[PDB]
Amino acid sequence: HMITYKKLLDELKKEIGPIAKIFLNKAMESLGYDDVDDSNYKEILSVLKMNKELREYVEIVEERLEKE
Amino acid sequence: HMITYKKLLDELKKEIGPIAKIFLNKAMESLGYDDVDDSNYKEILSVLKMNKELREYVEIVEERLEKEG
Numbered sequence: 001h002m003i004t005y006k007k008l009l010d011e012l013k014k015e016i017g018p019i020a021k022i023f024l025n026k027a028m029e030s031l032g033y034d035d036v037d038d039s040n041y042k043e044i045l046s047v048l049k050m051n052k053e054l055r056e057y058v059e060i061v062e063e064r065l066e067k068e
Numbered sequence: 069h070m071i072t073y074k075k076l077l078d079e080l081k082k083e084i085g086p087i088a089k090i091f092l093n094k095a096m097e098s099l100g101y102d103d104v105d106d107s108n109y110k111e112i113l114s115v116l117k118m119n120k121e122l123r124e125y126v127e128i129v130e131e132r133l134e135k136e137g
Binding site: 023026027029030031032043047048050051052053054 | 090091094095097098099100111115116118119120121122
């Protein structure tokens with residue numbers, strides 16, 4: 001059930017569609033993360049939750065991933 | 069004394085080198101901020117402090133800004 005780049009992008013796409021890949025990559029690049037895994041995914045989403053435009057959508061993505 | 073984009077980029081480049089430009093811009097863009105000002109600079113730096121390779125250097129910039137304040 002481990003989180004991967006593809007699982008995090010697929011969940012983000014369910015809420016924010018065609019801007020998911022570009023925002024994921026921006027946040028990863030800022031944070032210096034060279035992959036996505038269980039140890040860093042929450043940190044990536046925490047950055048994007050601070051963006052006022054994305055916040056409500058990112059909350060739903062985080063909640064769904066935590067369930068899994 | 070207001071923090072500006074130029075000021076913040078100049079402080080970061082002192083510690084991190086030319087690449088600071090891309091880290092600063094990618095943090096700003098992730099957060100949805102189109103400028104740097106007194107209201108948002110600490111939040112911008114908070115993102116860059118979460119970068120393990122940058123963290124000490126960003127702490128030094130924060131410290132230098134606090135001293136000047």
